[PDB]
Amino acid sequence: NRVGDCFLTVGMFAILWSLGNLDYATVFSLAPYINSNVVIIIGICLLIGAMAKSSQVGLHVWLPMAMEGPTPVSALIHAATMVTA
Amino acid sequence: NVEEPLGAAFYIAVGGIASSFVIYNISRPGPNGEPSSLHKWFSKISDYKDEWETRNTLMAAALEQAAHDKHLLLTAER
Amino acid sequence: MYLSIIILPLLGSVVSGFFGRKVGVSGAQLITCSSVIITTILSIIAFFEVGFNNIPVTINIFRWIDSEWFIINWGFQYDSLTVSM
Amino acid sequence: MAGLQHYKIAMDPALVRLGSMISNRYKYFRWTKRTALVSFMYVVVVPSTIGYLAYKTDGLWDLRAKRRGDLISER
Amino acid sequence: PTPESEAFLAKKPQVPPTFDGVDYEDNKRLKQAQDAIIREQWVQVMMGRLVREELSKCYYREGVNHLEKCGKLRERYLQLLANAKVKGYLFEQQNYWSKEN
Amino acid sequence: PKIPYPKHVWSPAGGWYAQPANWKQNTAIFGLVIFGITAMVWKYSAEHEVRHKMPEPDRFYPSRYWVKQIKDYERAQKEKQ
Amino acid sequence: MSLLYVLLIIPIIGIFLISTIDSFYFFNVSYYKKIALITTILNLIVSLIIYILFDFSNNQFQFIQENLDLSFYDIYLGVDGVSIYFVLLTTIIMPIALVSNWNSITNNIKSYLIIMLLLETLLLAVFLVLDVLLFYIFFESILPPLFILIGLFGSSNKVRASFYIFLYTLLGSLFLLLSILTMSSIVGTTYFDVLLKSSFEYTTQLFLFFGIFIAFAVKTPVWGLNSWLLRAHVESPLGGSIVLAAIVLKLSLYGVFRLILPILPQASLNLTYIVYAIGAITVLYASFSTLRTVDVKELIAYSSVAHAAIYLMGVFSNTIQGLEGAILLGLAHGFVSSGLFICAGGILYDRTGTRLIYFFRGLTQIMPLFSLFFFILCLGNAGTPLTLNFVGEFMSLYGTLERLPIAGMLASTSIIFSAAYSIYMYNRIAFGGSVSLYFIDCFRDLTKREFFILFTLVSFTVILGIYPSFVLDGLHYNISSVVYGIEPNASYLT
Amino acid sequence: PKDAVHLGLKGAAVVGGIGLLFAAVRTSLARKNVGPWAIFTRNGKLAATFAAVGGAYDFTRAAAANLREKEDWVNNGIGGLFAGATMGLTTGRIPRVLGFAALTGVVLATAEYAGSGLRGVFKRDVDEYERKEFLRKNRRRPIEETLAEIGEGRGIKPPGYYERRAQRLKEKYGVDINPVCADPDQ
Amino acid sequence: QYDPPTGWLWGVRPGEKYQNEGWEGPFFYGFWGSLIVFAIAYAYKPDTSIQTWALEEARRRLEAEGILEDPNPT
Amino acid sequence: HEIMIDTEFAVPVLFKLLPFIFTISFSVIALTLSELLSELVIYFKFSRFGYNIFGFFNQRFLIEFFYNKYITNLILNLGGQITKI
Amino acid sequence: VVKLTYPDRVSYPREFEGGLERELGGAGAVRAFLCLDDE
Numbered sequence A: 001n002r003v004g005d006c007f008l009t010v011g012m013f014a015i016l017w018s019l020g021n022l023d024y025a026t027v028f029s030l031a032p033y034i035n036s037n038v039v040i041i042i043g044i045c046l047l048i049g050a051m052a053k054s055s056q057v058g059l060h061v062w063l064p065m066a067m068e069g070p071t072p073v074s075a076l077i078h079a080a081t082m083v084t085a
Numbered sequence B: 001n002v003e004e005p006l007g008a009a010f011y012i013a014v015g016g017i018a019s020s021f022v023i024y025n026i027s028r029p030g031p032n033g034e035p036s037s038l039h040k041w042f043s044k045i046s047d048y049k050d051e052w053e054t055r056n057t058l059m060a061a062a063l064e065q066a067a068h069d070k071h072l073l074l075t076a077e078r
Numbered sequence C: 001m002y003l004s005i006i007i008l009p010l011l012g013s014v015v016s017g018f019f020g021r022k023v024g025v026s027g028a029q030l031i032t033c034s035s036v037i038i039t040t041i042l043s044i045i046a047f048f049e050v051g052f053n054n055i056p057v058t059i060n061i062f063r064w065i066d067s068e069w070f071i072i073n074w075g076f077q078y079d080s081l082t083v084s085m
Numbered sequence D: 001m002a003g004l005q006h007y008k009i010a011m012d013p014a015l016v017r018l019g020s021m022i023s024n025r026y027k028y029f030r031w032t033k034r035t036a037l038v039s040f041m042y043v044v045v046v047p048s049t050i051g052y053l054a055y056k057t058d059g060l061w062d063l064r065a066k067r068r069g070d071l072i073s074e075r
Numbered sequence E: 001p002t003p004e005s006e007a008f009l010a011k012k013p014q015v016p017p018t019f020d021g022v023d024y025e026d027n028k029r030l031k032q033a034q035d036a037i038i039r040e041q042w043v044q045v046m047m048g049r050l051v052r053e054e055l056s057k058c059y060y061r062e063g064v065n066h067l068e069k070c071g072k073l074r075e076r077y078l079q080l081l082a083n084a085k086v087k088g089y090l091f092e093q094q095n096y097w098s099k100e101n
Numbered sequence F: 001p002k003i004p005y006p007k008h009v010w011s012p013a014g015g016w017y018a019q020p021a022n023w024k025q026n027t028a029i030f031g032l033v034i035f036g037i038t039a040m041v042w043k044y045s046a047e048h049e050v051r052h053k054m055p056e057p058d059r060f061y062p063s064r065y066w067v068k069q070i071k072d073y074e075r076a077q078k079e080k081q
Numbered sequence G: 001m002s003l004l005y006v007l008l009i010i011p012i013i014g015i016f017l018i019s020t021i022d023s024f025y026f027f028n029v030s031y032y033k034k035i036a037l038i039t040t041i042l043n044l045i046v047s048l049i050i051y052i053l054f055d056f057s058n059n060q061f062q063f064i065q066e067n068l069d070l071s072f073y074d075i076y077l078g079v080d081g082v083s084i085y086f087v088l089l090t091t092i093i094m095p096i097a098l099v100s101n102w103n104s105i106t107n108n109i110k111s112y113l114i115i116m117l118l119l120e121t122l123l124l125a126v127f128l129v130l131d132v133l134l135f136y137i138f139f140e141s142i143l144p145p146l147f148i149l150i151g152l153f154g155s156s157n158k159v160r161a162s163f164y165i166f167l168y169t170l171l172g173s174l175f176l177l178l179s180i181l182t183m184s185s186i187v188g189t190t191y192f193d194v195l196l197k198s199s200f201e202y203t204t205q206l207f208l209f210f211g212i213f214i215a216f217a218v219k220t221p222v223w224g225l226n227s228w229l230l231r232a233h234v235e236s237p238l239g240g241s242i243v244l245a246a247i248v249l250k251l252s253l254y255g256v257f258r259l260i261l262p263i264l265p266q267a268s269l270n271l272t273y274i275v276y277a278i279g280a281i282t283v284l285y286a287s288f289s290t291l292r293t294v295d296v297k298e299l300i301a302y303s304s305v306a307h308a309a310i311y312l313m314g315v316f317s318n319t320i321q322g323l324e325g326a327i328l329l330g331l332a333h334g335f336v337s338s339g340l341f342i343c344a345g346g347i348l349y350d351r352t353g354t355r356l357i358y359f360f361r362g363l364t365q366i367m368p369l370f371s372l373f374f375f376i377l378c379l380g381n382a383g384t385p386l387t388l389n390f391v392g393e394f395m396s397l398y399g400t401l402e403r404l405p406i407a408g409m410l411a412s413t414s415i416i417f418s419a420a421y422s423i424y425m426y427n428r429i430a431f432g433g434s435v436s437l438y439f440i441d442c443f444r445d446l447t448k449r450e451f452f453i454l455f456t457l458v459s460f461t462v463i464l465g466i467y468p469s470f471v472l473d474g475l476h477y478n479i480s481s482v483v484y485g486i487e488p489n490a491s492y493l494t
Numbered sequence H: 001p002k003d004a005v006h007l008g009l010k011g012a013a014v015v016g017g018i019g020l021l022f023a024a025v026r027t028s029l030a031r032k033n034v035g036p037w038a039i040f041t042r043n044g045k046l047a048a049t050f051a052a053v054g055g056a057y058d059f060t061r062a063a064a065a066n067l068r069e070k071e072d073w074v075n076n077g078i079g080g081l082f083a084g085a086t087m088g089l090t091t092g093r094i095p096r097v098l099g100f101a102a103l104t105g106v107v108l109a110t111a112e113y114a115g116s117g118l119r120g121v122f123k124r125d126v127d128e129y130e131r132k133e134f135l136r137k138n139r140r141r142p143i144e145e146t147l148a149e150i151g152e153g154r155g156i157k158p159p160g161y162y163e164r165r166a167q168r169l170k171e172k173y174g175v176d177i178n179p180v181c182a183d184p185d186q
Numbered sequence I: 001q002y003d004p005p006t007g008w009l010w011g012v013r014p015g016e017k018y019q020n021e022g023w024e025g026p027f028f029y030g031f032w033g034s035l036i037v038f039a040i041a042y043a044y045k046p047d048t049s050i051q052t053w054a055l056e057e058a059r060r061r062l063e064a065e066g067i068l069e070d071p072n073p074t
Numbered sequence J: 001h002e003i004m005i006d007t008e009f010a011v012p013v014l015f016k017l018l019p020f021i022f023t024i025s026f027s028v029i030a031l032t033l034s035e036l037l038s039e040l041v042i043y044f045k046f047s048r049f050g051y052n053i054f055g056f057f058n059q060r061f062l063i064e065f066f067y068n069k070y071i072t073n074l075i076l077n078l079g080g081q082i083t084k085i
Numbered sequence K: 001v002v003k004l005t006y007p008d009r010v011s012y013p014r015e016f017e018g019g020l021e022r023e024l025g026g027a028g029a030v031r032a033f034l035c036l037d038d039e
């Protein structure tokens, strides 16, 4: 997951660099107006972060290894709430 | 049937939360913009309206002259 | 209500973990479940309050990070999606 | 062993011998084909590569307030 | 306009934000010039902070209609984002420039 | 069965099978401390919530009872004619 | 008697009382330790009084006392935002360093306390002097007390360690001295208020830059010039290690703000791609190396190398965020690395007598207070949010990425490896099986002393991690003065 | 230009002659009776090595000067590189070859860049008070001089940056610069 | 079934009380003590950060345009 | 980017009910392959084609064997070389 | 296989009056289909 957060951290850098802040009402107010290449740079980064925390084919190996915890933890954190971050 | 006492950790946290609530409320400027009694003391003591501006200017000018006098002595014609 | 949904699980986790000696096993189970249930109920109301009547709720508490252009606040925002999840 | 008495540990001779070899290893380094190449890879090439990329791309971009119809390339 | 508070009297720059006409030997006036450079830069940037703030309230208030109603507030921030940045006094102190060039 | 455990280890989480004889009492005091902070937070969240839209009177919006922004609006809106 | 001069005088009075009290009372060793501790407490109390009176938006140096009796080598003291928090960090840390050794010295206690008290006066003098030669005089004055501290109270390899830290620092500082003397010759003076006003020619700035950077790279340290840290920070006594990592590493960082950013901005701008290559290399090579380090203090010592690279990259970013992040990360690393050395050099090494990681396992089972603080310090060393370590890392890395993206991405990768080596160490010590079978005697958990020097360190990082504004509010206007550049439409108002 | 072979011979002779001096002292300080002909028998290698380093050094710098068609500090360091390399070859150890080449080439190059006063520093023959005063008070300079050394961008955005920025992009990418208005009313 | 809470805090056996090494006095009252006192004085400290000075000027300068509304026009 | 209108109307009925057809069909083969036939699968298992397929899918496409050896241990050897050389 | 066998679009792209240019952010943003090139 920390690998994903590095990509996500870089993604917020690209938001901060282009928009001055990373608050939701600002990013989405200016989204239709910024460089298309910027959005790809932005967009790719958080998808990789999203890839790690939702176990996509690249970073996916933690979720089944993460079944070494107690069963309710598997149900709550690793099957219905966090994987959906 | 041993009983576990509350201990000191409970009181510090509750006391800290209670003190934080009390201290913040009494430190507010109030409905009006007039500062508190203690607010005016911390401004009077830290006035320094131009004191750092005066002292610094004389120090810089004095050392600039001092550098000038050495430049004269160090570059004198042999 | 909007900010109570935030701190209630936090308080329940602090007491159970840092005072498990004081409340004991059943005391911890009583607080974590009660704090989560009370929090759970308030979310159901928030779904009606925000999702159904379309009132997004903005709550800003204090600044977190403030450097020149970056003003990141401990601010919370309720809209349709956050009450859905 | 130290100035302040500690607990009794099962100080394993093998592990003690391993931790001494590591602390003394610098005394036995030698210049060979292998040790020269590795020491040249890490110290010169990889740093000079990053320095080349850093030098070549310094000022290449600015993201600040970039819009559609305006590129990111700065140079 | 908002009245100038007592605090915003002791820190007003009595000098323009420039280095033309400043004798660098005289310390008070050079320091005042550096103060005027920085404070103007910060004043210009907190404009973006207030515009950003207003745009946030506009965005939520307008919901889906934010793409059509918050336009004036959108551009004003974008102009500020293009221009405002605390860059320091050091370049301008060390490098004179003229428009008639 | 219960696994053996050292009696000399002090852990704030309670340890291995900790349940003090006064667990019911302490669970009530901590609940009260938990309750008071939530009340303190609820009072804060009532004061500083921000809404740009006002709920219709008939709809089920239970926050209108305790928040200041809506209560001030409804109090002012009651003046008709 | 200025408050700043009071700061340098209190620890000297403590030295006097420590070395004379036997003529007024065989005096007990507890007396010496109490004199030294109270001495550092009153020094902390004075630094807190100064901070209350300190003004956040003044370009004048504050609490300066007029000398006017000019000599060749005079000591002028003054404080602004960039120096105020380093002074506070020195005054907070040193009492913790004194308590961290309360029971573990047991011999030459008078010498240990006098050396520790003298180090406080010198390190504070470094952050307070308003002259570039004055800066150098105090940056180097600490070597002989440091040399004798390690040799008197260090571990088995303290002879090689004390030589390494002395000779590395002197050799680099000699190149910084050459650069400093060139500046004073051209300008006639090294006083800050008039040396910053001057303008050096580009090639002069270039050669001035190498001389200064060679010293700041030995002290950062950068990777490849860091042998001295591996030896000294491990072989030193615990108090020495805390001071060495949490205060002495910061002198080169504070020195970049006073010696190169204001006077060498063209050189700094044109050479960033060299600083960033070294900074990027240090982030990777150190991170990989500490993953394979088997001495627990050397692992924690090696982490300091990786983090120091991140705030070294920040100070050269020429951005408001990078510079604020660099001071905040240097401050954050001061608390967290101090706690990790207390955990390793103080808690583990006093119980076992060894620092090899092979001998530790399952310590959580018998020591849940140590593991609770150790984990929070392992999170903070990994840059986890709600620690001041995250706010500093994010702001420092954002500036690095904006100034030069290729170095930012590589320096960003430290988000993986800091976590990697910090959590891996944590598991091999606190988790990872049941209590190690090598321990014959059972271990006790944290004593009240160990709990409260860790709770204090984890409180500072967490509170500052939730509200970093306490520190950022006093850095905004002064940090602004060191930025070099202009905007197309804001420059040259008329 | 210069004669590389002729200069090297003079280079080989001058520092080889001192080696011949040091060789005679070894023969003089020799304990066992070896006669006068041990100048070239037991110590001839010593004098030969000196004549080799001095020859290699003066050959290559002269050669480096011919190849580069310039006279600067680079040539003495290059001269010292082979001079250092030659001494290492006598020990028959590759690290000795590289290290002594590095040592010699560095000292002999910083000696020529700095111009060590061992023969005398260059006298400025000017009012040395005036040079210091100019360097002391040159506190503000024309922006063009800085722009030559530091260039444009990297946070250095002088007035008129955006106009020339569009022109540079058009010349390189053939794309007109025109940011879109963010207001629907425009 | 549950065990009664056990364990020795600070290693103190149930028979005796924690012994003081002498650091507790200065540390709890001089170090932490002064750290709470300073915190109290910080609530009353005047706000001299550049930002709030700048927001006040940024406000008026924005009120000269149509972005903000003047509480006291003219 | 809206495609929802075509989803309700343009989609053909066969593809709309196609997942149900496979769901209610392939259940019976799986239910017949056990407790009714119960040996067709083992015949596939003990062939050389089935044995290689079975393990590959059981070893999770091998995206953890190349991870552990060519990613994780590469870094560990890189750290080894830097400390020792 | 899918590239050689996949159905063509069975509906003309929807057209919004005025292109929704004002509602999507004016001419400076991306608008919808309005009497545009066939696809």
Ligand SMILES: CCCCCCCCCCC(CCCCCCCCCC)(CO[C@H]1O[C@@H](CO)[C@H](O[C@@H]2O[C@@H](CO)[C@H](O)[C@@H](O)[C@@H]2O)[C@@H](O)[C@@H]1O)CO[C@H]1O[C@@H](CO)[C@H](O[C@@H]2O[C@@H](CO)[C@H](O)[C@@H](O)[C@@H]2O)[C@@H](O)[C@H]1O
Binding pocket: A010, A011, A013, A014, A037, A040, A041, A044, A045, D060, D061, D071, D072, D073, D074, G401, G405, H173, H174, H175
């Ligand atoms: C995590 C990212 C995930 C991946 C997403 C990538 C998405 C794509 C982004 C790629 C990007 C973003 C910068 C990345 C880093 C910036 C911040 C880092 C991240 C911040 C967190 C890097 O693109 C760079 O690549 C360089 C390669 O050398 C080139 O530099 C120079 O190359 C040589 C001259 O071209 C020089 O000789 C050499 O001297 C330079 O060096 C440039 O192409 C450019 O600077 C910009 O790509 C874009 O550049 C522009 C100009 O090209 C293109 O526009 C086109 O220009 C016309 C002719 O081109 C076309 O006619 C026209 O149709 C179109 O208008 C775009 O089409 C696109 O290409």
Ligand SMILES: CCCCCCCCCCCCCCCCCC(=O)OC[C@H](COP(=O)([O-])OCC[N+](C)(C)C)OC(=O)CCCCCCCCCCCCCCCCC
Binding pocket: C013, C014, C016, C017, C018, C020, F009, F011, F012, F013, F014, F015, F016, G364, G365, G366, G367, G368, G371, G372, G375, G376, G379, G380, G384, G385, G386, G387, G462
């Ligand atoms: C960011 C740094 C941390 C900031 C927050 C600091 C804490 C804030 C409040 C956290 C919630 C309360 C946690 C209580 C956990 C249970 C108490 C405990 O430590 O028991 C020790 C327990 C003892 O519990 P025990 O009762 O089972 O002990 C006896 C049995 N043995 C000894 C065998 C275990 O020790 C452990 O087993 C675990 C060791 C590691 C402990 C880590 C606990 C969590 C610490 C806080 C995590 C904060 C996460 C921050 C996330 C950041 C997000 C960006």
Ligand SMILES: CCCCCCCCCCCCCCCCCC(=O)OC[C@H](COP(=O)(O)OCCN)OC(=O)CCCCCCCCCCCCCCCCC
Binding pocket: B013, B014, B017, B020, B021, B024, B025, C003, C006, C007, C010, C011, C014, C015, C061, C074, F033, F037, F040, F041, F044, F047, G466
């Ligand atoms: C790990 C923690 C991470 C925290 C991250 C930062 C917070 C984000 C997550 C929490 C979100 C909600 C935070 C709490 C919001 C409300 C705080 C509060 O209690 O305010 C009430 C009090 C008076 O209100 P007042 O500010 O005067 O309103 C008018 C001013 N215009 O205002 C006050 O000033 C009173 C302050 C009282 C002390 C603080 C109370 C904190 C409540 C949460 C405590 C959590 C820790 C628990 C510790 C152990 C408890 C057993």
Ligand SMILES: CCCCCCCCCCCCCCCCCC(=O)OC[C@H](COP(=O)(O)OCCN)OC(=O)CCCCCCCCCCCCCCCCC
Binding pocket: G008, G015, G019, G110, G111, G114, G115, G118, G121, G122, G125, G141, G142, G144, G145, G148
């Ligand atoms: C602000 C500018 C300040 C300028 C300098 C002003 C003075 C600074 C201090 C200089 C030296 C002062 C020495 C103070 C201690 C003298 C009193 C004394 O006698 O202490 C004796 C002490 C213990 O010895 P004793 O108790 O007699 O034997 C017991 C055996 N069971 O034995 C000791 O304490 C010896 C301690 C070890 C040696 C000191 C640390 C190394 C110092 C290197 C000296 C050379 C560099 C000097 C640097 C000065 C500061 C920069």
